Design a protein around this ligand. Sequence first.
Ligand SMILES: CC(C)(COP(=O)(O)OP(=O)(O)OC[C@H]1O[C@@H](n2cnc3c(N)ncnc32)[C@H](O)[C@@H]1OP(=O)(O)O)[C@@H](O)C(=O)NCCC(=O)NCCS
Lengths: 371, 366
Amino acid sequence: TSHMGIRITGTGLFHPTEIISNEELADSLNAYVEQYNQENAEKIAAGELEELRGSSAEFIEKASGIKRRYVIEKSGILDPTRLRPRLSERSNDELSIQAEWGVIAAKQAMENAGVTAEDIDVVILACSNMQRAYPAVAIEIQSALGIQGYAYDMNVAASAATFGLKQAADAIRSGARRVLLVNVEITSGHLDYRNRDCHFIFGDVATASIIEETTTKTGFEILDIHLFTQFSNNIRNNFGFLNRSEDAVVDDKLFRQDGRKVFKDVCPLVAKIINAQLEKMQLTANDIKRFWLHQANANMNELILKYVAGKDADLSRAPIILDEFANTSSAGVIIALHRTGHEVDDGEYGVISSFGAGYSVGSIVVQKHVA
Amino acid sequence: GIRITGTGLFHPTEIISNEELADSLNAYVEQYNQENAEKIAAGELEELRGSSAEFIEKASGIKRRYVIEKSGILDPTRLRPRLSERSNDELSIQAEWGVIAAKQAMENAGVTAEDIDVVILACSNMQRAYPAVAIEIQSALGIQGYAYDMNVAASAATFGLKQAADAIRSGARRVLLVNVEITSGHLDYRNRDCHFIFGDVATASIIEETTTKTGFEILDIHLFTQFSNNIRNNFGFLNRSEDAVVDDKLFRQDGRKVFKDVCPLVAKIINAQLEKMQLTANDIKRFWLHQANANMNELILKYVAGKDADLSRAPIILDEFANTSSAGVIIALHRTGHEVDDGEYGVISSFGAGYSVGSIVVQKHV
Ligand SMILES: CC(C)(COP(=O)(O)OP(=O)(O)OC[C@H]1O[C@@H](n2cnc3c(N)ncnc32)[C@H](O)[C@@H]1OP(=O)(O)O)[C@@H](O)C(=O)NCCC(=O)NCCS
């Protein structure tokens, strides 16, 4: 009863068209590993450097549940002479790529919510990486849509959507009418496509949500929010604007992870959060029609789902979209909600729970209202 | 009832005066021109122009600034601070500065780590994307709850104060707001138009639900953004995939156009806010304005107050720190909030890149 009338009333989804199957990608890494492992063969049999392993489509799917992923530009990523998208600098007078994707997803969420630019007071860009420091990309999006009010960029990586939803609900509580929350994840821009353990994890996407105070629109009423962060170096990327002054050389300016430590750390934390949240609301797990969990690893989600809802929880109650999208970082829970929110009936309960880098966890109990 | 109950400030040790900086750039532009005698004459490359300490101070009021590392900035063969990578086990530079300012703010507010529910890092440039350095600051301080990074450049502190106030109204007890500005990391020291503008600093503030603690109670907030390319830095994580070649990956601005747009917008927002709160300029003890250019602040204060407006009513710290982007208003509040007595009013107004403007009416309580 903290957010009476505050509802997610529309979502929108954009992905780039080109697709990389697990096989195209595992092949690409394999080529690069075969040429690196023989270019440096004199030093491989010398204890000095490195021994590179490849991978296969079946190794990816069993570690993750991922099958394919959308990407901004497929040639450069798959090319073993490059291993990164082939993009072109845009002039200042055109929409940046991040603004461009955000606008596409935003127009869809606005149409789904039945609102236009004049109805929106706040724009939040919340994702794991921003294309530039200033002017804020959220302000670029606000201006492209013709929105008046104010906008800002916000980063807490994997949990940026749930943290942003709280910030949206807070701004509405204090007087905002409606908030546009945008998540643009171009993860192919900071993915290390050379590493077998992480090159498959992420895909590209833009999501958007409309949050409004309303007693007359269909949407998900926000009932309770628990945000949590606890510093961890087990996921980290050291690229930044001070690298040039550091004359940096350490090859750690991309995604890096100790996935085993993350697995062991994150699943118990998330399950503890959700269960304490359910007890606080006096809901049982059986009262929850849908768990929209972070969309990174089906093996994590299955563990959490069993910890929270029981070994016999039906799989339809925890929709998986990472099979199609791979990990879209902050946008994951929103994709899942965008695809399956229609599966929740009026009066029924759902839980949105992000978790990942920073160690950040964000968990939101919602209830559907159909008008 | 929400009050700013404590502020904290940190600046690095080494100081650069305008003449050191002008000397340094003049040496670079002469080496550049003494080299390319041909392409200047060939109508290909333009002849770079130098700088003068006299212009800097008359145009802006800045006299000196604190820098993270001095010799690399002044070196005409380098023109950027000399820094070292730290391993993940060590506190990063941005978190380190933020921790120092935060401890001072916490001590000034009479609160400890267990008292804080949210940490916001709000500034114009984050040292990395993930893990958020606000979470690194939260952990270093032993604070529990949650933390996030937030960027709206010049107005990050005022937007962050609004986000802090909103979280408290939703049930947070107290919020720590940190602004760390290592502008020497993204300034273009080759460009005479902008090399003198920015300095380095960190600031912090404690915001609390209280009616019993000395602080500035927040009474109204107006935030505004309007996209403009007149201040822009195109550096980012997609440059690599772009195979970028254009030399626009540092601070860049058209200063005259910024003045024409932002000055009347600021005067209009502050005046509209005083009307809504049924205050007059005469009711405002102190205006803590963005600390970028003293001449502009003076002109803004004349269009808001009146011909007889004491210049002391708009404190200046940019003479000492230069432009400190998001932290500027907080240095002003920290250095001169003691000059506001019980029941008196103040205005905090940040403005600049994005275009962004944030304006806050406060009232002191003792
Ligand atoms: C950046 C700023 C200090 C420059 O001051 P200014 O009075 O506007 O200077 P101008 O851009 O008009 O140019 C002044 C002249 O001196 C020259 N000049 C510029 N920098 C110089 C320098 N460091 N040294 C010597 N001469 C310089 C210029 O070339 C120009 O001559 P030109 O146009 O024939 O080439 C000022 O414009 C500013 O603060 N802009 C930002 C405003 C803001 O942030 N908020 C607005 C508050 S309302």
